[PDB]
Design a protein around this ligand. Structure first.
Ligand code: PJY
Ligand code: PJY
Lengths: 329, 329
């Protein structure tokens, strides 16, 4: 039912957007079909955890506060696709960064703009008569801004914006929080509260704290898998070492490395050479980082498992969806 | 006074945005100064015609409907900078299209996202208590969407989105209308009406028609200058022929060329070779396109000079600013 309903609303949203282009923006059929394929390629095929989380928050709140049921759930589905389209937008922007005018790059830039604009167009249409439309747009735009700021923190973590000084745990958490947690964990919860009209009924402090912690938990595991999970099992080629990323492994290693090891880490980090990357993996191994990884996640899990309880003391139904969200993590 | 006030509000807007980053987004000084320089580099130095047009529309309407004066004019200045920041955003995106992770491209993509997000942040702050905030955001987002659609029309005018068939005058006007006229001509007028509270008092049909015509007038001259005005006088190297652009010259030539000339045009268009570009300029000359250019602009000017009168029959003060805007064109 959840996934089936999410996909039906995708067809409805897509058909509105494409007909709007045909009927109001003078678009020719060849380009409409081109954009339908681009939308399908970039928005479909993931796990939809961000979008389905909006649905789950919405259904948990209509069970603990007929016609309002159907409207809120449909609104939850449109909000889920807003976040999924926003995610598709970030992925396209990421692909440009590592990919006679080159029309494929021109079309990639254009795709990224269209995907973001479509979040606005689908909200303005489907929520035109909702009282929360203005607050919805503002919180959505603020989270999107936050994500772009987090991307700046991430991309410049090894230089001086006109260098391992910013390789600290607090900066690592700043990157995770702004670059990932806000739009991936906080935003689905907030939107589920907005369409459920129950926004001012929750402790947003605990809610923000949980979203940040859950993003941190997921990103630490992601960082360790990027380095140790082999590509055919990870689903991609891990490249954090080559890319000099401010990863959990890097910042944890630098806190417990010896002076000559840090020299060896610094001499080998951020290189595509197979032996230097292997040297970094070797250093991580010797420092027992995969052992510290288990303890770190355990401590985070304890903070999460205990923070949902504060939340449920005044917002019981909200906590069950946050628990399901955390369970997926 | 107009330019002086526009620049003072720039400092106010910039200081709000940078302090917000420092105070609410955990940004370090090095990055704040980096973003201040980027903002200055990308947003300042133009002619500010889009932004000042908002101011001019606002002052013309408070003279023909003390405290409301100062508030509306300040709102007009924030709106002007919204459009100027949006323009800076499009220019950055354009530069990426024709410009080991490459951090300059990463930072260019990031700049483009920040510049767009800043239009939302400055609106949400300075208009937080305005009744028009929701309508303002929606019309702004719709024009931005329109511009991205026009960019798609422009970039794909020579191919089949998975070719001179789309080299027609009606498609040329579709490109100009969506890619330029809406955000450059229509949007400043609309925003000036919104902050002046006089939006539902104007004939939006005539207003849209004027904005489209004025964009067309300006783009036709731009197209002819791109081909014939030498670089040190044009301010850039004209490259429409090399880039196979659907320009006014191209579509006008194809309507009056002979079969063997179209073969010669088709064989030489869209090439960087100096002789093929010169062959295209030669063909344009022989067809007396610079003579037809004068007549075309004259006819457009007549439609403009006569459409402002319909506008002033019910919206007199609005027409004087539209006249000043047209005068700049
Ligand atoms: C638990 S996985 C998840 N849960 C909620 C939203 C998004 C995700 C996700 O797919 N990533 C990669 C974080
Ligand atoms: C008349 S020039 C102008 N007027 C109003 C808004 C923008 C402009 C402009 O600079 N271009 C390049 C169109």
């Amino acid at each position: 039912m959840p996934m089936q309903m999410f996909m039906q609303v995708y067809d409805e949203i897509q058909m509105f957007l494409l007909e709007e282009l045909e009927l109001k923006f003078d678009m020719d059929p060849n380009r409409v079909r081109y954009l339908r394929k681009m939308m399908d390629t970039t928005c479909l095929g993931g796990k939809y955890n961000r979008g389905l989380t909006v649905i789950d928050v919405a259904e948990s709140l209509l069970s603990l506060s007929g016609a309002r049921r159907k409207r809120v759930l449909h609104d939850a589905c449109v909000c889920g696709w807003m976040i999924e389209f926003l995610q598709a937008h970030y992925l396209v922007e990421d692909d440009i960064m590592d990919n006679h005018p080159d029309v494929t790059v021109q079309c990639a830039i254009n795709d990224g703009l269209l995907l973001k604009s479509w979040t606005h167009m689908m909200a303005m249409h489907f929520f035109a008569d909702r009282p929360f439309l203005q607050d919805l747009l503002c919180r959505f735009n603020r989270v999107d801004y936050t994500t772009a700021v987090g991307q700046l923190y991430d991309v410049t973590s090894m230089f001086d914006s006109n260098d391992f000084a910013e390789f600290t745990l607090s900066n690592y958490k700043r990157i995770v929080k702004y670059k990932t947690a806000y739009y991936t964990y906080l935003l689905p919860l907030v939107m589920g509260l907005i369409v459920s009209e129950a926004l001012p009924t929750v402790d947003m402090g605990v809610t923000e704290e949980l979203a940040m912690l859950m993003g941190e938990y997921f990103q630490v595991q992601d960082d360790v898998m990027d380095c140790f999970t082999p590509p055919e099992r990870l689903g991609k080629v891990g490249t954090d070492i080559q890319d000099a990323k401010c990863s959990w492994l890097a910042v944890t290693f630098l806190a417990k490395a010896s002076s000559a090891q840090v020299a060896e880490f610094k001499a080998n980090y951020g290189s595509g050479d197979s032996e230097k990357v292997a040297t970094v993996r070797r250093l991580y191994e010797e420092a027992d980082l995969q052992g510290d990884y288990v303890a770190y996640e355990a401590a985070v899990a304890e903070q999460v498992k205990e923070l949902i309880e504060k939340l449920r003391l005044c917002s019981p139904g909200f906590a069950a969806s946050v628990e399901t969200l955390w369970g997926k993590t």
